[PDB]
Amino acid sequence: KIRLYQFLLDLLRSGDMKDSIWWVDKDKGTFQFSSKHKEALAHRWGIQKGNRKKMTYQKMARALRNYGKTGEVKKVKKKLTYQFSGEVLG
C-alpha cells in the first residue's frame, strides 16, 4: 500500500488537487494545506486506504505528527504547513 507522505508528494507533483494543497518553497520541500479545502484531500486519503471511517484532517494530521520521529515530514511554524525531508524528495 501507499504511504501518507507519498500520497501527498504525489499530489503536489501531479497538481491533481491544487485547490487543497500547494508548495510553499519547492526547493526547501515545504507545502501547505488549504484551510477550507483540506477536508476534501483528507477524504481522498481515507478512501485510497479503504478505511472504515471517512478520513478527516485531524486524523491525517495525527498520522503526520508520527513522521516527526522518523523524519519524513516535520511540522513547520506556519499555519497548516509541513516539510518533506531531502531523502523523501531524492
Place this chain on the structure above:
DNA sequence: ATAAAAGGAGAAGGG
C-alpha cells in the same frame, strides 16, 4: 478579548 481552529499526544484498534 473571544470563539474557532489549528496543534498536540497517549492509548487502543485495524489493514
Place this chain on the structure above:
DNA sequence: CCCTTCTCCTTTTAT
C-alpha cells in the same frame, strides 16, 4: 508497521 480511531488538553488564528 503504518497508520487509524478516540479522547482530552493546549496554542494559534480568525472573528
